[PDB]
Amino acid sequence: AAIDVVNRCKELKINALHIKLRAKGGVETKQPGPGAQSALRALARSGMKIGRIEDVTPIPTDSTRREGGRRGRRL
Amino acid sequence: PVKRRNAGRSQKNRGHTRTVPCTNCGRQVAKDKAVKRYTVRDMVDPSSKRDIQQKLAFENEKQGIPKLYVKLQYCISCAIHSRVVRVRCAEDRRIRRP
RNA sequence: CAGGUUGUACUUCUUAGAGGGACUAUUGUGCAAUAAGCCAAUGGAAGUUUAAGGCAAUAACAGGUCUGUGAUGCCCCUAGACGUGCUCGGCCGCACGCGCGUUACAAUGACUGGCGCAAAAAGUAUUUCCUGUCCUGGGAAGGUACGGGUAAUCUUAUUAAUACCAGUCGUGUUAGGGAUAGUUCUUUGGAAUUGUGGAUCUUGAACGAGGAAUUUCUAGUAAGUGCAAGUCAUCAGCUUGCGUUGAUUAU
RNA sequence: GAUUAAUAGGGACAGUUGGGGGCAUUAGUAUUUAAUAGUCAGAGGUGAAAUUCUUGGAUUUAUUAAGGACUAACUAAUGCGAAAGCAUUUGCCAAAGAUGUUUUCAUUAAUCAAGAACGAAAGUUAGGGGAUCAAAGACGAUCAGAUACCGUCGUAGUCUUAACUAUAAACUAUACCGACUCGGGAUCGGCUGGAAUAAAUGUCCAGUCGGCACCGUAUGAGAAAUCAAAGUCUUUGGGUUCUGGGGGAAGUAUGGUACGCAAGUCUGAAACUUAAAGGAAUUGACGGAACAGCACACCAGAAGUGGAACCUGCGGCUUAAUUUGACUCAACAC
Ligand SMILES: [Mg+2]
Ligand SMILES: [Mg+2]
Ligand SMILES: [Mg+2]
Ligand SMILES: [Mg+2]
Ligand SMILES: [Mg+2]
Ligand SMILES: [Mg+2]
Ligand SMILES: [Mg+2]
Ligand SMILES: [Mg+2]
Ligand SMILES: [Mg+2]
Ligand SMILES: [Mg+2]
Ligand SMILES: [Mg+2]
Ligand SMILES: [Mg+2]
Ligand SMILES: [Mg+2]
Ligand SMILES: [Mg+2]
Ligand SMILES: [Mg+2]
Ligand SMILES: [Mg+2]
Ligand SMILES: [Mg+2]
Ligand SMILES: [Mg+2]
Ligand SMILES: [Mg+2]
Ligand SMILES: [Mg+2]
Ligand SMILES: [Mg+2]
Ligand SMILES: [Mg+2]
Ligand SMILES: [Mg+2]
Ligand SMILES: [Mg+2]
Ligand SMILES: [Mg+2]
Ligand SMILES: [Mg+2]
Ligand SMILES: [Mg+2]
Ligand SMILES: [Mg+2]
Ligand SMILES: [Mg+2]
Ligand SMILES: [Mg+2]
Ligand SMILES: [Zn+2]
Numbered sequence: 001a002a003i004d005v006v007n008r009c010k011e012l013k014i015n016a017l018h019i020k021l022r023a024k025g026g027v028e029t030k031q032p033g034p035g036a037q038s039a040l041r042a043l044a045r046s047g048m049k050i051g052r053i054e055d056v057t058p059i060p061t062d063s064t065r066r067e068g069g070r071r072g073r074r075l
Numbered sequence: 076p077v078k079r080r081n082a083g084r085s086q087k088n089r090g091h092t093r094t095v096p097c098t099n100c101g102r103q104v105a106k107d108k109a110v111k112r113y114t115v116r117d118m119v120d121p122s123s124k125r126d127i128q129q130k131l132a133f134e135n136e137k138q139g140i141p142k143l144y145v146k147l148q149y150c151i152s153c154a155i156h157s158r159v160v161r162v163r164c165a166e167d168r169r170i171r172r173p
Numbered sequence: 174c175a176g177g178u179u180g181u182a183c184u185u186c187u188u189a190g191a192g193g194g195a196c197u198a199u200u201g202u203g204c205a206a207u208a209a210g211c212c213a214a215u216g217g218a219a220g221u222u223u224a225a226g227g228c229a230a231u232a233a234c235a236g237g238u239c240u241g242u243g244a245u246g247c248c249c250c251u252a253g254a255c256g257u258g259c260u261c262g263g264c265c266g267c268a269c270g271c272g273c274g275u276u277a278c279a280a281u282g283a284c285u286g287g288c289g290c291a292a293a294a295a296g297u298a299u300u301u302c303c304u305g306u307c308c309u310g311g312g313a314a315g316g317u318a319c320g321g322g323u324a325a326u327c328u329u330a331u332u333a334a335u336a337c338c339a340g341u342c343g344u345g346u347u348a349g350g351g352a353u354a355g356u357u358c359u360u361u362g363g364a365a366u367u368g369u370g371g372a373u374c375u376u377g378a379a380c381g382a383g384g385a386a387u388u389u390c391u392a393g394u395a396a397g398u399g400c401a402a403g404u405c406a407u408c409a410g411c412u413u414g415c416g417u418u419g420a421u422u423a424u
Numbered sequence: 425g426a427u428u429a430a431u432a433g434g435g436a437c438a439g440u441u442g443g444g445g446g447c448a449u450u451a452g453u454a455u456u457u458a459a460u461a462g463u464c465a466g467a468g469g470u471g472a473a474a475u476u477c478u479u480g481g482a483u484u485u486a487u488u489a490a491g492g493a494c495u496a497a498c499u500a501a502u503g504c505g506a507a508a509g510c511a512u513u514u515g516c517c518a519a520a521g522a523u524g525u526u527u528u529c530a531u532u533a534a535u536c537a538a539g540a541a542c543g544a545a546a547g548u549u550a551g552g553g554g555a556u557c558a559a560a561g562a563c564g565a566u567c568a569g570a571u572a573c574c575g576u577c578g579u580a581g582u583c584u585u586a587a588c589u590a591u592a593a594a595c596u597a598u599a600c601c602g603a604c605u606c607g608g609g610a611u612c613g614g615c616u617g618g619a620a621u622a623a624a625u626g627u628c629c630a631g632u633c634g635g636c637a638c639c640g641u642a643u644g645a646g647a648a649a650u651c652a653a654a655g656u657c658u659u660u661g662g663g664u665u666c667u668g669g670g671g672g673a674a675g676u677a678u679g680g681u682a683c684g685c686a687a688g689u690c691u692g693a694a695a696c697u698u699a700a701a702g703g704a705a706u707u708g709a710c711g712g713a714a715c716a717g718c719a720c721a722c723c724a725g726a727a728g729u730g731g732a733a734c735c736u737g738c739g740g741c742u743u744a745a746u747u748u749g750a751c752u753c754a755a756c757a758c
Contacts, residue, residue: 016132020485021118026454027556029098031145037119040127049132053118053141060454061512062494063096065557065582068574072101075573076649076704080638082595085501088636090594091509091544093499107501146497155714162714 002042009048017043018051025058027066032057079168083151084108097150099157104150110159116143 009015019040023032044050067073085107086092094103118140119127127140149159163170 027096032143037123041119041123044127044130048130050127050130051133055141055143058454059496060494061452061496062454063496064455064494064555066096066101067557068101069557070103071573072097072103073574074100078649081501087501088503089505089510090507093495093511095496106499113497144497158714 002039006046016049019053020056022057100153102150110149110154113146116145
């Protein structure tokens with residue numbers, strides 16, 4: 001999915017990319033998935049220039065009753 | 076009989092402490108009790124950064140990739156099982172910051 | 174090139190007795206606190222504590238054996254006895270269910286012929302044990318013709334089989350395979366019939382590499398291949414050993 | 425002619441401290457959901473998938489809006505509150521501790537049946553509100569079985585006003601007031617001396633009251649775990665309240681019947697039945713628990729039983745009789 005984009009990008013005539021990295025912040029594991037460090041890595045290797053890099057996983061101030069409840073995923 | 080003095084938690088004055096959801100099971104755990112370890116995570120693995128540095132672009136203030144900030148909160152129940160804190164022996168149970 | 178001798182001749186081969194020889198040695202990384210030690214290389218018959226075994230601690234399994242015991246407690250039987258002996262049966266009986274194994278499905282083979290390669294075991298009171306030479310039988314096996322040994326002296330320094338060269342067969346459950354069965358002949362034993370073993374000519378089944386599972390096994394080891402020894406009058410498909418041919422993969 | 429003024433207690437006062445409380449106000453992301461644009465075939469969810477959602481555009485990216493709850497990171501054996509409980513800003517309203525006192529008052533006090541004030545959740549009545557999560561329910565999956573532990577949705581609730589309900593491992597499972605006794609630093613609040621900078625609602629050094637808490641230790645306590653109090657109790661007596669008297673039946677009843685709209689609370693038996701039920705530790709064994717090893721245990725592979733016919737052992741069934749032992753490795757060519 002990464003290398004597929006770079007090809008499409010050389011055609012848009014774009015070489016540099018700004019990265020806004022997230023991961024369903026909301027009320028979910030505010031930790032990046034696995035296909036994260038993998039995607040970036042692919043863009044850099046397949047050429048691509050990399051602009052600034054941000055982390056935009058939406059951290060909330062409050063919260064709302066998460067996945068599961070009281071005890072959550074059990075087993 | 077009694078196993079701990081703090082029973083795992085630090086509630087020392089007040090009668091009640093806010094409850095918080097577990098980073099892993101989602102379970103509700105009292106703040107004070109639950110395990111914590113807010114860590115400074117790195118975006119890419121070791122040898123993998125160098126690959127992104129050469130194909131990097133923007134200026135180079137020598138500030139590299141922003142490091143990921145993970146505020147970790149585990150409830151005992153899964154905290155253990157998750158290799159975090161292993162059942163410690165008798166007198167080592169009072170040791171803090173080994 | 175075989176054979177016979179002979180020498181107070183020699184020991185390499187063989188025998189076996191003394192004594193050597195490795196201890197992890199020498200060299201550099203890992204360990205490293207100093208270490209104990211671990212690794213690799215070199216030298217080495219020999220470096221996994223050299224290889225393979227023997228011996229095998231404290232507890233215990235109410236494991237197994239009173240059918241090995243003139244080791245026994247208790248309880249049983251006692252002369253038409255569970256004593257002892259004799260004759261004849263049986264433990265191998267067959268619809269089947271398990272467990273060691275033996276042989277094989279074949280051309281990296283089978284069959285015919287040729288070929289001095291081995292090891293370890295055994296062996297008698299007269300003929301009674303191992304049996305060499307010789308004679309007779311198609312053959313198993315006979316005879317007693319000539320002989321050695323109660324053994325590094327005699328069966329023997331050889332009688333293995335796999336292997337190797339030649340030839341026939343040529344994918345064909347063909348005969349690879351040999352179960353089942355039928356006369357004959359021969360050896361052990363008073364007796365073999367509910368085939369002792371062995372020879373002959375036939376008969377010629379399943380088997381075409383085997384499901385779910387599952388056992389051992391790292392080197393002269395697996396495997397294959399024969400030879401012994403126990404049992405034994407006669408009977409091995411078992412056991413305990415022996416050598417030949419000899420590898421994949423790990424460490 | 426009226427004792428001191430209790431390291432007793434009540435008031436006055438002074439700066440100050442606190443996520444204490446009640447009204448206001450005020451944000452902030454996020455979750456939903458909506459608009460405005462933007463594409464493009466997959467999203468989402470699990471170990472795997474599946475119902476679910478989607479080119480009458482999903483998931484996705486940017487802006488913005490509506491809405492209900494929530495207060496992150498700082499937030500820790502730190503703070504306040506009688507307890508339950510309490511963390512966005514700012515502004516009011518009455519309150520509180522501690523410290524500071526050469527201020528008054530001078531026993532006013534300790535604890536308490538009656539008798540009252542509170543008391544997360546869940547739950548109840550009548551209205552609001554309804555974003556997220558979600559009992560019951562509807563579905564997928566998982567299983568031999570799953571109306572269960574996962575997954576997709578969803579009603580009550582969860583939020584609020586006004587009533588009612590009072591229980592909870594309402595826990596330090598350790599009643600309040602008081603006096604003593606070991607060591608030690610670090611804390612939070614107040615005060616007093618001092619030093620450097622600097623002249624700071626800061627920092628440090630040293631005191632010290634009062635408040636969580638920890639460390640070390642006891643010829644003090646205990647059944648021990650452990651306890652600085654769970655200590656100053658056979659050397660058995662500072663003051664006061666509540667509670668227990670083997671276990672199960674049971675905190676349950678056609679019980680009581682004081683509360684309650686209703687769940688139920690409060691009080692609370694007996695019959696029956698029993699050597700034990702319990703507490704704390706010691707060793708061992710086991711763990712669908714941590715850590716560390718070792719073995720053809722598995723890894724890499726070989727050979728091969730298992731299938732075939734024979735052989736031989738065991739079972740079974742026969743039989744006059746088929747001698748009997750042995751049965752997971754630790755029986756069966758023994
Ligand atoms: Mg509480
Ligand atoms: Mg040895
Ligand atoms: Mg022994
Ligand atoms: Mg005996
Ligand atoms: Mg008789
Ligand atoms: Mg003869
Ligand atoms: Mg011989
Ligand atoms: Mg032929
Ligand atoms: Mg016959
Ligand atoms: Mg025969
Ligand atoms: Mg053999
Ligand atoms: Mg013989
Ligand atoms: Mg024999
Ligand atoms: Mg306030
Ligand atoms: Mg979802
Ligand atoms: Mg908003
Ligand atoms: Mg504070
Ligand atoms: Mg905040
Ligand atoms: Mg009330
Ligand atoms: Mg309502
Ligand atoms: Mg099924
Ligand atoms: Mg939901
Ligand atoms: Mg001062
Ligand atoms: Mg001080
Ligand atoms: Mg006591
Ligand atoms: Mg202490
Ligand atoms: Mg007393
Ligand atoms: Mg009642
Ligand atoms: Mg116990
Ligand atoms: Mg039998
Ligand atoms: Zn958890």
